[PDB]
Write a protein that binds this DNA or RNA. Structure first.
Lengths: 58, 175, 142, 207
RNA sequence: GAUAAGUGCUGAAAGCAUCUAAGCAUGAAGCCCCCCUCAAGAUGAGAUUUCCCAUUCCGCAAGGAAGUAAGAUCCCUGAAA
RNA sequence: UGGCACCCGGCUCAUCGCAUCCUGGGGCUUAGUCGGUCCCAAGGGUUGGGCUGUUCGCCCAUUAAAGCGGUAC
RNA sequence: UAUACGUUAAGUGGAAAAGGAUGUGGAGUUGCUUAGACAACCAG
């Protein structure tokens, strides 16, 4: 799950560590890596989550 | 004053063109040379003078710079006049040498040696105990003189051998 | 219950030039691309990589004095047989083999690693014959 | 360079002009015919092909007849390639004859040696015998088989096996006499191979 | 063809010098080629020349089966093996 | 009822290290003839006998040379 | 293949050093010291 999330995040410009820190800080959005694997199935929502994390990260 | 950090004057009768990779083609009456330097080397060359400074105080420019600027004026001389060099091969039977063109030498050592001179140099010396040579570039003329110096070899016991311009022959404990 | 992958994949074609780039700093990225770690559908037991074409492989670069000190050894299994080559000869005589060795040393061992290695094409010079596959240029992100 | 193919006939002696005696090997070589010219832009290296001996129709299949169709000739028994020769003095149908060699010219001879079958260590590699008749029970055996530490046997250790029957070359032989009416060459010395076999004569490599 | 110990010419820190740092030459029975032999199971399984061809059945297509072409083998007389 | 240190040779087959015996290339210290010394170099080569327990070993005659060692003698 | 400040150029980093060593970046001092060094170059 970590490897897949890392690849999906690097497809957006973020890295895994920065994305996880932003998610942990942009509220929490408790999301197990298993359920954040949804990058494979529906990539659009994963981009929304990454956008929120980026918005809080800066 | 570092060896090379000077203002080298020139007769202003030569041609110079510049390109990238420090490709500086210096021509004129006769010579045409091109010495390329690493790009960090700043270039400051006027019509005749070259007031090149050092980009940095570290050894890539605190020491190497003095190597470059100096030799720059060298091309001008090599472009304009030429160069000369001298030698001697003093010996009892050291008259063996070339009768023009290619070199042919019997050392008295029972093996002869044959060499053909290259382009860019002229040799005008009838008596071969002394050697006088001329050319266009100091580097090539020095190599040529090195060629003829290596032709003959000295011996310690006897006061005879091959020497540079005005030089003595090695002497050792031979008895 | 995540999703694995089984034969329902597509492999793209990428072309990377090796002009100026150092040996390892390019080989690592190329190996990572070859294993297929750059896509979210990664799978350890299935090949999901792409095809990598390298051009201008003879203009590679090495830092320091390695160009005259790095030595490639091999053994012929006979007594006293230990052949050696300096990096300069490897660069000026077999440029593609040095790149192939560097990339191959960075791939997992076993059947899948050796089958992964078959997707790499290395050419000396700036011309390749792979035209019908429509290669797409790809710069080194790292 | 230049070369030709032939068949060995045997050995004899010849008296030279000053009155001394020299051994001679007789090579019989009917004229050869070129069959193919391999070029760089089509095959990757300059070469020519030569055929030597005629064989009747029954001992020939359609591919061989088709191959020899281009240069009009009967099917040939032996076909060999020569490379390094000048490629502008040959045609597809040209004929190579023994007159190309002149008496007193150095040459090379390549051929396949005889066979001796399964042979032991002493005859195959020229090793030594153990002592006899001093309480010793060691004769003709290969010898010790390495040291103890490696826990294995090194490659290259020589052991009995099938002997002979491989290509070899003899260099710097010279020609004593040549005649074209019988297509015979007389080399000085020995030549590898059994009688009636195939031997190739080439120009000197060392020169 | 480059290289070791060495020999040099240019020229540096450092106006001088200076075979040494950027450079350029020469230099060993070692090192790669040249000589000889094996070598595409090199699964990366290469190349050129020549010969045979689009057979019959069901299955309408694919497909699968049978008899064959070029060519081999079984069997017999042997030995340069 | 002292003193104070230590804890098998021969045969048949070979292979490796260089801390080089010969051959190659050098400085040298050495008229040349030579010889001594010190660097670089492991490719190849490096002997037949008599007395003898081959010893804390003698001799004979050759060769460009009759190297030192590791591999459970 | 994060963000800042310095060191090292030899693969030191990747065992433990006597002994030897112009390798040597900084913080010091101590000299003579632009009517004046290190090359100065002309001149007992």
């Amino acid at each position: 799950w970590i490897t897949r999330i890392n690849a999906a995040a690097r497809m957006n410009g973020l890295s895994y560590s920065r994305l996880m820190h932003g998610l942990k800080l942009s509220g929490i959005e408790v999301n197990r890596k298993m359920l954040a694997d949804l990058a494979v199935n529906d990539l659009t929502a994963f981009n929304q989550l990454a956008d929120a994390a980026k918005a809080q990260l800066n | 004053s570092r060896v090379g950090k000077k203002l080298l004057e020139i007769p202003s009768d030569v041609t110079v063109t510049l390109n990238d990779n420090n490709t500086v083609a210096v021509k004129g009456p006769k010579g045409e040379l091109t010495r390329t330097f690493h790009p960090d080397m700043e270039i400051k060359v006027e019509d005749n003078v070259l007031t090149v400074a050092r980009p940095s105080d570290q050894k890539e420019h605190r020491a190497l710079h003095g190597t470059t600027r100096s030799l720059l004026g060298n091309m001008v001389e090599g472009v304009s006049k030429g160069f000369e060099r001298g030698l001697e091969l003093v010996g009892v039977g050291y008259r063996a040498s070339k009768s023009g063109n290619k070199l042919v030498l019997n050392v008295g050592y029972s093996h002869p040696v044959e060499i053909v001179p290259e382009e860019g140099i002229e040799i005008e010396v009838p008596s071969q105990t002394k050697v006088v040579v001329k050319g266009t570039d100091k580097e090539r003329v020095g190599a040529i003189a090195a060629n003829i110096r290596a032709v003959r070899s000295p011996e310690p016991y006897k006061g005879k051998g091959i020497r540079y311009e005005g030089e003595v022959v090695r002497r050792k404990e031979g008895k | 219950t995540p999703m694995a992958n089984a034969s329902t994949i597509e492999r793209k074609w990428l072309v990377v030039d090796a002009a100026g780039k150092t040996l390892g700093r390019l080989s690592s990225e190329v190996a990572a691309i070859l294993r297929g770690k750059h896509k979210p559908t990664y799978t350890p037991h299935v090949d999901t990589g792409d095809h990598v074409i390298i051009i201008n492989a003879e203009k590679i670069e090495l830092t320091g004095k390695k160009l005259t000190d790095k030595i490639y050894y091999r053994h012929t299994q006979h007594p006293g047989g230990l052949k050696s080559r300096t990096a300069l000869e490897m660069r000026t005589n077999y440029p593609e083999k040095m790149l192939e060795l560097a990339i191959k040393g960075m791939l997992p061992k076993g059947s899948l690693g050796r089958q992964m290695f078959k997707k790499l094409n290395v050419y000396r010079g700036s011309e390749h014959p792979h035209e019908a596959q429509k290669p797409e240029v790809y710069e080194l992100r790292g | 360079t230049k070369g030709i193919l032939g068949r060995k006939i045997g050995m004899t002696q010849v008296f030279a002009e000053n009155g001394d005696l020299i051994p001679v090997t007789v090579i019989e070589a009917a004229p050869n015919v070129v069959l193919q010219k391999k070029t760089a832009e089509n095959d990757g290296y300059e070469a020519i092909q030569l055929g030597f001996d005629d064989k009747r129709e029954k001992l020939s299949n359609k591919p061989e007849k088709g191959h020899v169709a281009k240069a009009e000739t009967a099917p040939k028994r032996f076909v060999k390639e020569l490379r390094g020769v000048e490629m502008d003095a040959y045609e597809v149908g040209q004929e190579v004859k023994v007159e190309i060699f002149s008496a007193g010219e150095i040459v090379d001879v390549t051929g396949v040696s005889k066979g001796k079958g399964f042979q032991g260590a002493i005859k195959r590699h020229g090793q030594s015998r153990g002592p006899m008749s001093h309480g010793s029970r060691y004769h003709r055996r290969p010898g010790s088989m390495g040291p103890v530490d490696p826990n294995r046997v090194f490659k290259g250790k020589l052991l009995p096996g099938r002997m002979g029957g491989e290509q070899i070359t003899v260099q710097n032989l010279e020609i004593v006499k040549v005649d074209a009416e019988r297509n015979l060459l007389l080399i000085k010395g020995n030549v590898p191979g059994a009688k009636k076999s195939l031997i190739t004569v080439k120009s000197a490599v060392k020169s």
